[PDB]
Amino acid sequence: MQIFVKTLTGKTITLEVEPSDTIENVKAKIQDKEGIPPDQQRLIFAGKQLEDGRTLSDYNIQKESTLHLVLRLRG
Amino acid sequence: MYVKLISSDGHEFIVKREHALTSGTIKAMLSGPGQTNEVNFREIPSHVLSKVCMYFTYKVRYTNSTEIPEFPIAPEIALELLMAANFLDC
Amino acid sequence: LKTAVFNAARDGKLRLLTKLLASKSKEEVSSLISEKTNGATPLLMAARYGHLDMVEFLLEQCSASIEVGGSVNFDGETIEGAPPLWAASAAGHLKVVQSLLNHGASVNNTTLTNSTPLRAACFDGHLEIVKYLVEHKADLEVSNRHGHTCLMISCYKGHKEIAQYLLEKGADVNRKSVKGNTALHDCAESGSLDIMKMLLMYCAKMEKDGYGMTPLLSASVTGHTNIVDFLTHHAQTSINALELLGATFVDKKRDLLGALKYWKKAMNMRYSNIISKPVPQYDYAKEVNSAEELEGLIADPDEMRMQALLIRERILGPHPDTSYYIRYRGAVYADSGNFKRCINLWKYALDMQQSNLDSPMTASSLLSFAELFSFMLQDTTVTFDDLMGILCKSVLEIERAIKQTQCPADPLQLNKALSIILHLICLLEKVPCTLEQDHFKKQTIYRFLKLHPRGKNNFSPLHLAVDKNTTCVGRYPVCKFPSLQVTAILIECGADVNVRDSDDNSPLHIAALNNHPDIMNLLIKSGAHFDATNLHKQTASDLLDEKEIAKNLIQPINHTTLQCLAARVIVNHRIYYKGHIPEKLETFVSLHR
Amino acid sequence: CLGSVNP
Amino acid sequence: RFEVKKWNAVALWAWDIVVDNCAICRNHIMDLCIECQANECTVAWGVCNHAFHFHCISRWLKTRQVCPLDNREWEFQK
Amino acid sequence: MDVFLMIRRHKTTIFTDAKESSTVFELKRIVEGILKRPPDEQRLYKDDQLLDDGKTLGECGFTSQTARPQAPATVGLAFRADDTFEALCIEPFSSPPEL
Amino acid sequence: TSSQKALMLELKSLQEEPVEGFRITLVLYNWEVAIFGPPNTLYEGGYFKAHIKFPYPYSPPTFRFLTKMWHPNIYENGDVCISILHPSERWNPTQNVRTILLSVISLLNEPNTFSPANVDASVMFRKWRDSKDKEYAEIIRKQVSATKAEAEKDGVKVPTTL
Amino acid sequence: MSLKPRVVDFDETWNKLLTTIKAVVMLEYVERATWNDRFSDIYALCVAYPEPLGERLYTETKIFLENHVRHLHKRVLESEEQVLVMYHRYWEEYSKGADYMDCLYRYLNTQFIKKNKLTEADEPLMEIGELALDMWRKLMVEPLQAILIRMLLREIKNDRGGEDPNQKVIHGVINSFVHVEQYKKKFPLKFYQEIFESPFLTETGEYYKQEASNLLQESNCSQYMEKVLGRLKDEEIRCRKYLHPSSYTKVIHECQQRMVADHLQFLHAECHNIIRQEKKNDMANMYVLLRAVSTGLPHMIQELQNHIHDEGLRATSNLTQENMPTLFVESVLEVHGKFVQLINTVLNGDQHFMSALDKALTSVVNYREPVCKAPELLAKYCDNLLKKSAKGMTENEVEDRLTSFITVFKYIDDKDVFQKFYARMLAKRLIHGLSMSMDSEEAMINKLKQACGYEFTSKLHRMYTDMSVSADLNNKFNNFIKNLGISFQIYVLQAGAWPLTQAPSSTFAIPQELEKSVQMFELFYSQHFSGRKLTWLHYLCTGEVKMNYLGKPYVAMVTTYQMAVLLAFNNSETVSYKELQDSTQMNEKELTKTIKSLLDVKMINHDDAESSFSLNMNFSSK
Ligand SMILES: [Zn+2]
Ligand SMILES: [Zn+2]
Ligand SMILES: [Zn+2]
Numbered sequence A: 001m002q003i004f005v006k007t008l009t010g011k012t013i014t015l016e017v018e019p020s021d022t023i024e025n026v027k028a029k030i031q032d033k034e035g036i037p038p039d040q041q042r043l044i045f046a047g048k049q050l051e052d053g054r055t056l057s058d059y060n061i062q063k064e065s066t067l068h069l070v071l072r073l074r075g
Numbered sequence B: 001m002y003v004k005l006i007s008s009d010g011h012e013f014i015v016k017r018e019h020a021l022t023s024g025t026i027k028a029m030l031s032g033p034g035q036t037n038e039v040n041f042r043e044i045p046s047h048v049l050s051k052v053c054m055y056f057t058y059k060v061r062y063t064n065s066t067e068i069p070e071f072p073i074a075p076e077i078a079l080e081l082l083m084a085a086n087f088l089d090c
Numbered sequence C: 001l002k003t004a005v006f007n008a009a010r011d012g013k014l015r016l017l018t019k020l021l022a023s024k025s026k027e028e029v030s031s032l033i034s035e036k037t038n039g040a041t042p043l044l045m046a047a048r049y050g051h052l053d054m055v056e057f058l059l060e061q062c063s064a065s066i067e068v069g070g071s072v073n074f075d076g077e078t079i080e081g082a083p084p085l086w087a088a089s090a091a092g093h094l095k096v097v098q099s100l101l102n103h104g105a106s107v108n109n110t111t112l113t114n115s116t117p118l119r120a121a122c123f124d125g126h127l128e129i130v131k132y133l134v135e136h137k138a139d140l141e142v143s144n145r146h147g148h149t150c151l152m153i154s155c156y157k158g159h160k161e162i163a164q165y166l167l168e169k170g171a172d173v174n175r176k177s178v179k180g181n182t183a184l185h186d187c188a189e190s191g192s193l194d195i196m197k198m199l200l201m202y203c204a205k206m207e208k209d210g211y212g213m214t215p216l217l218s219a220s221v222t223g224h225t226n227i228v229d230f231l232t233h234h235a236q237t238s239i240n241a242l243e244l245l246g247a248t249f250v251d252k253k254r255d256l257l258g259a260l261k262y263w264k265k266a267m268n269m270r271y272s273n274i275i276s277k278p279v280p281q282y283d284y285a286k287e288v289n290s291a292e293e294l295e296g297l298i299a300d301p302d303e304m305r306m307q308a309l310l311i312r313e314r315i316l317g318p319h320p321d322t323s324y325y326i327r328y329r330g331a332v333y334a335d336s337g338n339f340k341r342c343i344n345l346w347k348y349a350l351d352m353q354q355s356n357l358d359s360p361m362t363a364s365s366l367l368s369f370a371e372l373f374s375f376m377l378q379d380t381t382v383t384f385d386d387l388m389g390i391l392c393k394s395v396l397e398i399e400r401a402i403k404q405t406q407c408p409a410d411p412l413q414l415n416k417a418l419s420i421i422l423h424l425i426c427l428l429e430k431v432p433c434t435l436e437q438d439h440f441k442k443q444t445i446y447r448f449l450k451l452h453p454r455g456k457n458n459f460s461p462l463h464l465a466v467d468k469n470t471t472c473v474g475r476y477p478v479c480k481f482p483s484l485q486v487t488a489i490l491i492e493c494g495a496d497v498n499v500r501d502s503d504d505n506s507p508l509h510i511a512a513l514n515n516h517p518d519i520m521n522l523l524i525k526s527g528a529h530f531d532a533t534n535l536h537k538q539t540a541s542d543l544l545d546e547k548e549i550a551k552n553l554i555q556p557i558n559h560t561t562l563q564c565l566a567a568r569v570i571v572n573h574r575i576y577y578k579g580h581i582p583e584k585l586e587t588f589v590s591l592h593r
Numbered sequence D: 001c002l003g004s005v006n007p
Numbered sequence E: 001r002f003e004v005k006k007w008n009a010v011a012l013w014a015w016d017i018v019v020d021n022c023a024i025c026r027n028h029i030m031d032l033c034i035e036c037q038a039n040e041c042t043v044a045w046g047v048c049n050h051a052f053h054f055h056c057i058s059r060w061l062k063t064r065q066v067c068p069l070d071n072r073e074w075e076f077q078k
Numbered sequence F: 001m002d003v004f005l006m007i008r009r010h011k012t013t014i015f016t017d018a019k020e021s022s023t024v025f026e027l028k029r030i031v032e033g034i035l036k037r038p039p040d041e042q043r044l045y046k047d048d049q050l051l052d053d054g055k056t057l058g059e060c061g062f063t064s065q066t067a068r069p070q071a072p073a074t075v076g077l078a079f080r081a082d083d084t085f086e087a088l089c090i091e092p093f094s095s096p097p098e099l
Numbered sequence G: 001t002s003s004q005k006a007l008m009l010e011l012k013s014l015q016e017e018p019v020e021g022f023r024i025t026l027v028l029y030n031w032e033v034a035i036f037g038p039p040n041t042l043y044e045g046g047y048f049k050a051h052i053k054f055p056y057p058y059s060p061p062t063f064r065f066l067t068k069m070w071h072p073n074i075y076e077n078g079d080v081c082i083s084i085l086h087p088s089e090r091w092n093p094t095q096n097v098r099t100i101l102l103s104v105i106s107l108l109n110e111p112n113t114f115s116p117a118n119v120d121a122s123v124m125f126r127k128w129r130d131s132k133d134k135e136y137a138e139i140i141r142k143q144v145s146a147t148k149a150e151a152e153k154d155g156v157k158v159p160t161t162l
Numbered sequence H: 001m002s003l004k005p006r007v008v009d010f011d012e013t014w015n016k017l018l019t020t021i022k023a024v025v026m027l028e029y030v031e032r033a034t035w036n037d038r039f040s041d042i043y044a045l046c047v048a049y050p051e052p053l054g055e056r057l058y059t060e061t062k063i064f065l066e067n068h069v070r071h072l073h074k075r076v077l078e079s080e081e082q083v084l085v086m087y088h089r090y091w092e093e094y095s096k097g098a099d100y101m102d103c104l105y106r107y108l109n110t111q112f113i114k115k116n117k118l119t120e121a122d123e124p125l126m127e128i129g130e131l132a133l134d135m136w137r138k139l140m141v142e143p144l145q146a147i148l149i150r151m152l153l154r155e156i157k158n159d160r161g162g163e164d165p166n167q168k169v170i171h172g173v174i175n176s177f178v179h180v181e182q183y184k185k186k187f188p189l190k191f192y193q194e195i196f197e198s199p200f201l202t203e204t205g206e207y208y209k210q211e212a213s214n215l216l217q218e219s220n221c222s223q224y225m226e227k228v229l230g231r232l233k234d235e236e237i238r239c240r241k242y243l244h245p246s247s248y249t250k251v252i253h254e255c256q257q258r259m260v261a262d263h264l265q266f267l268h269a270e271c272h273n274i275i276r277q278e279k280k281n282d283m284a285n286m287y288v289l290l291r292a293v294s295t296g297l298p299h300m301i302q303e304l305q306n307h308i309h310d311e312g313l314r315a316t317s318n319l320t321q322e323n324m325p326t327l328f329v330e331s332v333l334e335v336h337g338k339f340v341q342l343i344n345t346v347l348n349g350d351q352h353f354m355s356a357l358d359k360a361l362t363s364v365v366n367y368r369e370p371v372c373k374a375p376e377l378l379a380k381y382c383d384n385l386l387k388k389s390a391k392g393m394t395e396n397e398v399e400d401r402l403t404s405f406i407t408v409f410k411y412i413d414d415k416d417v418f419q420k421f422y423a424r425m426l427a428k429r430l431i432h433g434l435s436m437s438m439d440s441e442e443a444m445i446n447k448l449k450q451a452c453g454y455e456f457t458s459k460l461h462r463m464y465t466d467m468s469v470s471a472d473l474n475n476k477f478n479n480f481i482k483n484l485g486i487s488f489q490i491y492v493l494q495a496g497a498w499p500l501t502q503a504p505s506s507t508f509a510i511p512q513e514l515e516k517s518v519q520m521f522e523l524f525y526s527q528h529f530s531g532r533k534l535t536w537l538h539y540l541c542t543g544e545v546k547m548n549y550l551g552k553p554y555v556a557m558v559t560t561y562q563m564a565v566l567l568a569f570n571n572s573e574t575v576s577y578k579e580l581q582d583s584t585q586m587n588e589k590e591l592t593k594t595i596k597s598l599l600d601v602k603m604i605n606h607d608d609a610e611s612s613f614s615l616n617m618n619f620s621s622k
Helices: A023-034 B024-030 B046-056 B078-088 C002-011 C014-020 C029-033 C042-048 C052-061 C084-090 C094-102 C117-124 C127-135 C150-156 C160-168 C183-190 C193-201 C215-222 C225-231 C244-252 C256-261 C265-271 C301-316 C320-335 C339-356 C362-377 C384-403 C413-429 C438-449 C461-465 C484-493 C507-513 C517-526 C562-573 C583-591 E055-061 F024-034 G004-016 G098-107 G119-130 G135-153 H011-025 H032-046 H055-077 H083-104 H106-113 H128-141 H146-155 H167-176 H190-217 H221-239 H248-262 H264-276 H283-290 H297-316 H326-346 H351-364 H374-385 H398-410 H415-430 H438-452 H455-481 H512-528 H560-571 H577-582 H588-601
Strands: A002-006 A012-016 A042-044 A066-070 B002-006 B012-016 B038-040 C070-074 C077-082 E006-014 F002-009 F012-019 G022-024 G033-035 H487-493 H533-536 H542-547 H554-559 H574-576 H604-606 H612-615
Touching: A012 A023, A023 A042, A042 G098, A066 G098, B012 B046, B024 B038, B024 B078, B024 H032, B024 H106, B038 H032, B046 B078, B046 F012, B078 C562, B078 C583, C002 C014, C002 C029, C002 C042, C014 C052, C029 C042, C029 C052, C042 C052, C042 C070, C042 C084, C052 C094, C070 C084, C077 C084, C084 C094, C084 C117, C094 C127, C117 C127, C117 C150, C127 C160, C150 C160, C150 C183, C160 C193, C183 C193, C183 C215, C193 C225, C215 C225, C215 C244, C244 C256, C244 C301, C256 C301, C256 G119, C301 C320, C320 C339, C320 C362, C339 C362, C339 C384, C362 C384, C362 C413, C384 C413, C384 C438, C413 C438, C413 C461, C413 C484, C438 C484, C461 C484, C461 C507, C484 C517, C507 C517, C562 C583, E006 H542, F012 F024, G004 G022, G033 G098, G119 G135, H011 H032, H011 H055, H011 H083, H032 H055, H032 H083, H032 H106, H055 H083, H055 H106, H055 H128, H083 H106, H083 H128, H083 H146, H083 H167, H106 H128, H146 H167, H146 H190, H190 H221, H190 H248, H221 H248, H221 H264, H221 H283, H248 H264, H248 H283, H264 H283, H264 H297, H283 H297, H283 H326, H297 H326, H297 H351, H326 H351, H326 H374, H326 H398, H374 H398, H374 H415, H398 H438, H415 H455, H438 H455, H455 H487, H455 H512, H487 H512, H512 H533, H542 H560, H554 H560, H560 H574, H560 H577, H560 H588, H574 H577, H577 H588, H577 H612, H588 H604
Parallel strands: A002 A066, B002 B038, B012 F012, E006 H487
Antiparallel strands: A002 A012, A042 A066, B002 B012, C070 C077, E006 H533, F002 F012, G022 G033, H542 H554, H574 H612, H604 H612
16 A cells, blocks of 8 residues: 655655555665665654554554654653 | 241241142141141251152152152151151141 | 882782892891881781782891881772781781781781771671681770771671671670660661671660661661561561651652552551641641541642651651751752742751751751852842841851850861852842842841951951952852952941951952952052051062053052151161150051051 | 752 | 747746755755845755755854764765 | 252242253242242352353253152252342251251 | 744644644744644543743754643653753754654653653653553543643544544 | 140140130131141140040030030020021021131041941941031021921912012021031931921922912913913922922922822813814923823823824825825825924924824725725836836936835735735736836835845845846857747746746647747757756747738737647638647637637638638738
8 A cells, every 4th residue: 555754854755565564664665765764763653653663554554644754862 | 829838947948839738737727717828837847847848749740650769768757757747647 | 219119019029129128238128118108118018919928028027017007098098007917807818817917916906097907807898807817816896986896897788797707706796886876777777687687696785876766767767678677576666667768768769659658557557546646836738647638649749748758857856867858859849940949948957957066067058058049040030038048047157156165166167158158148249129128138247247257267258258269159150259249248338457367468468469450449448558568578569460450550659648658667677666656656657567 | 860969 | 821030938947856945944945045035155965865055054064064864974065 | 851959048948840951041930939039130059050041951960860859959049138249058957866 | 033934934834734733822932832642542631731932953942831740751840851952863953843743742652761850750650661550540630631621621622533 | 846745734725725716616817827826736635645635625625516506596596587697697607617627626537536436337426517517407406497497488488479588598598408418328318308398398289289279260271371381480490599409300290290180181171172173382382291290191192193093084085086096195195294294393202192193094094995905006006106108207206206105105004915916017017028127126126125124025036136137048048059030039937936827728839940949948048057947838928920911011919829820820721610729739718719809800701610710811900
């Protein structure tokens, strides 16, 4: 299917991914399509952090959905 | 525009009025029912008045100013000078 | 020369010293051995660092530095008067101890704190040295100048084997130090429930110290639950003992649920018949007395905090612990942006401290007040009333300290207090307030100055205000000294202007030493002799530097009269003015040297 | 993260 | 039949090529800087695919060096 | 460069000021002002040397280092009796008792 | 005040196109931004209020709440402790508002215990994570009841789905 | 013979001091010599070797001054209603004597007396002049207070008209209260303030209340004002004739407060009436004394605002001819100028009333009968000013009129609406070459920028710079091309600057030579600069056709649609609607409109869906 992701530059983009790819793969695709390393990436959906070691199905992300990309953060 | 001073021995000394107004006592003695005007003294020797008059032309010339010389005082008239300075408040 | 024989004794190079001791005779071989090299002796350093082969050789040459007390280093601190046997014991150098003793070293020679070789081996826990020293007639009950026994320090450091061995060899379990401390307390403070059980095998009696504390209470203060749990079922203790640790948790661990675990086991048996609690005479805490009202406690943290503060203050009674914890909560609230309540908790602490220490730390609380005020005012607006209250309570301590006549006050705490007061005045200077209390603050300064206090180098409050070294105001942006405004109030209030310190100096001298034209002009306008002569026949004007302040700053011919010129000749030639002048001018001559 | 006091 | 002598026309242009903007000063790439708007300066480039501003990138170059998105390095050449 | 002078006649003493370029005829105008006499009946002296009425304080001496304010120089005078001349006269000041 | 135009443009763009938990009632210099309770986690039943006195790419803002909160990474007065609010990777000059709000709404989901601010809240939440404390649950339920009352008074409650 | 410390008799010294000390206070002739000799006696008494005595001198002088002041008190009390005359002479004599005595006692002042306690506490010893003034105060505090105050108030009650009281005596008596000068600690004027300023203020208040009531009993507001101004100036001139220069403000304040505040209701009705009428000499007279009376302005300013608003509405829409926008600007300018001239001439500034005028003007400008029409007329006025040529318009006056129009522009509330209208006018003016001078346009843009803001006016500056850049790029392409039988003049436009960005929807075909011209221009422009896509607009490109086949050759300045139609007609004399439709690709409405416009002058004829038109040789024109 396909998902939508909003980059830090205000622009919006879409990615062609299936519910089988892992979150790490999603971040990799976002990097090649935008140009930001995955270490400085954080995916948020419905106000929740997206762990790298998992897959889209674990979060019940349907097609045409939207994902917000933000920088990293700590305590 | 000068004032006349007389010592206890009979010497008449003349200094300028602005020079003489440095000492409070002379200013008071001239300001009142007393104002060539003679300010007569009866307890001051000649060799002390002759020095105080010279000191008068020392704080009107070196005021608001270099290599200021030290005032010379002979050791033989120091006590009289100290006694007279209090009376004249110079 | 000998500075080289000793640094190889310390560092242990044995081959080097043997060749430096072959190039010299056996009569001067003793002079280098009795060195003062950085305070110690060649034989001492040879024992501190365990160089057995070289300590034995050092002694075959001269066995006369063997009881010499010198300087040693342990844990960074430095110890004075330590003999070599003592130092070989503290380090664990067992074979160095055996050798030292076989050459006839006193097993009883101590440091200046009167710490025996036996006690030294007990500290780091060298059991085998301890046994050997005991077998060589060490005295189990010689203690240091505080009365801290070997058994005591062994319990404090948790050494069960050594403590057992000392008890086995007959050590008295019930010794009291000078502060009333017993080995049972050292078990409590270290959580050594093991060693406490062993001390009780010898019928150890449980007592209060000078501070009024039992081991059970001492374990509660320092937070060792194993002791406090153990002692709540010991028949030698009489609910009360299991409620101070609840507040100790809130003080130290900050585990609110840990505290709520208690205050419930401390209140179910309190009612399981009824017992009341002492009433007071802080936010009006009014501690909870009903169990039903003692059910909502995790609902709010503030109620729990104030209740813990109240119970600690009540049961413990006013002691550094309670004031420390009150100021702790005040500082925490100040950090958490509650400046209104955070300041009020500190005034009560200061008032409580103004009873038991009539102190090294009352000035600490005063400077903490000053730091908080500086942070707050450097930008809620600071109210005039709190600052006035802090100023009056600051002057009160100085008045109490000076007023008594039983011992001189050492001139450094007075200097610190005076610096605090000057900083407080500088802060007061720029807070706007009406005219009904300006007279009040000025009257306070008048009554402070009329006390005539003294400080470091017999200094006056004006001296500090005209000194650059007084600028020690803290670690926060600026209270720079000397300043025109702070001294303006001082002369405008009635401070003496011609006071003399130990060096026979005057405010004008100290002002001129730092080349400040405004301060000197203000002092001269207030009235001070420009020709004052200090101890080494110096005047104020002669203590000037460079040319910018030397010229056009202050003209000396204006502030000099013929009266003050004729005095110099008299004092330089000694004309014996004793009875030839009016009595008024005698003091004028005596000061215008 | 002030408390410039010590026990 | 008919003919023609002169023809006039107009046309519009836009960098419909980079399809990007400045992420620092938050304006279109073909626009003046806010400091410049307070009253001619060019536009810089990076070794990355990212194209940054000139005055914004200089102002942040006074503090650090690397891409604000990529803490790697800076080139400034092209 | 102004010099300082101090004139005497018998017990009388006059303190005055002058410039190093001032002529004798200028000083013997302040002298006439202080006590009312014509400037044609004075014979201003220095030591035992009559001063010509043409000098500008250059030839006669009176430098700016020998006539400092705290140590003024000495100049005498002698008036007339309308018939003949009168010699210079100065009596000393009262001496310190015993030092 | 040079960047006020760009700030207003970004505010209008975000108001027209919000993402999640981003309600603004600006009156920036006095941004009365409202933060929402995203579902599928703790609380989420109420809508809060917040203020900012941001003095933009160099000087970070000062995010201050209004209703009190009880979790490790907050100051009880009004402030939160967030690394990207203090100058390796911390407070890059870009990524002004959207990234900050995303970071805040992410940080109010799993606080960092290595460096805490409210130690009591830190210990209570660590105990709850170890798991049953119910103290955090009780305080959360009480405060969401209060925030739901406020949101019913003014505004509209945030639904679970969008 | 020597100033050494000595022992001397006391009674012999006082018997000589008391003789000179009496003449100094009473101002009698003392010989000059004795004045100098008496200075040594005080010094001798102050430094006597056994038991120095200055305290006895102080006490005896105190006794003497007390006795003298008591004797003077008795003599001046036995005066029989002539207290003022004697008191003044005695005060002059005593003040001079005290100053001289302070001069005489200098050494005792400087040596002994300066040994008092302190500044304050935050019998007492004082100097000699201070002590003498204190004794006179004890004379004049308990007795001679009521009588003196009553007589002074009677004089300043004979104030109104009457004869001329002796100014010197009254002024000196009042001045005596302020001659306590050594008392300088936060209150050198307390004595005078209380003792005199209370009854004087009370009496003045009562008297002027009565006077105001009497005056208003028999006058109107046109006459009350002048009399108030006269009596408030007479008081000012006679207050500096008797009092001290610290009571003018309070006296004038009390008089003004009493009169105006107590009678403030009378004047409000009059000011309400007269603002409508002219009353040229009334606003100034009323304002000059209504300004200072607490709060009374908020009514006058409000009614001035109301009058201005009504007067404006009486002209801004009175005629509404709906043919000339310039009348609006002319009327607003006349009203603004008249009101500003009047206020600056009469009210003397008063920025508050300028603000009131502004507030009324921003409401009249948006006058509306239930959007605002002001932006349309303003934009039309600006456009019609900058026309090609008409009558005798001159370029040294249009700048002057614009500098006046900016004032009217300031008051528009809908700032964003004006931008669209002005942008449309500027685009139509520039992309058609109807402007007068490019220098003038820069002037208008500069005035708008300096009046509004830099960011608010960027787009028009971008358009102006784009026109300049197109002017340069024309020559640049002309040079770079030769490195086409149709004369060329192109314009390069921006994207967001030019508000005609309608998305195209008709794919019209391109003429034959236009293909080669477009290819050449595109390649050359790309070589000159890269990174830009150049779109083509088919609805502003207008060329011309030069035809010579008919008897009269014609030149048709025509847009590209009819040139495409004529090129389709080039192949065959008769062209049907089907091939007209398929020669291009566009909405049929535009094609029908073009065909109808062609038939309007009938340059072609018809013989729909497949209608066959043909060239028409039967039409001729100029
Ligand atoms: Zn930028
Ligand atoms: Zn720029
Ligand atoms: Zn990059």
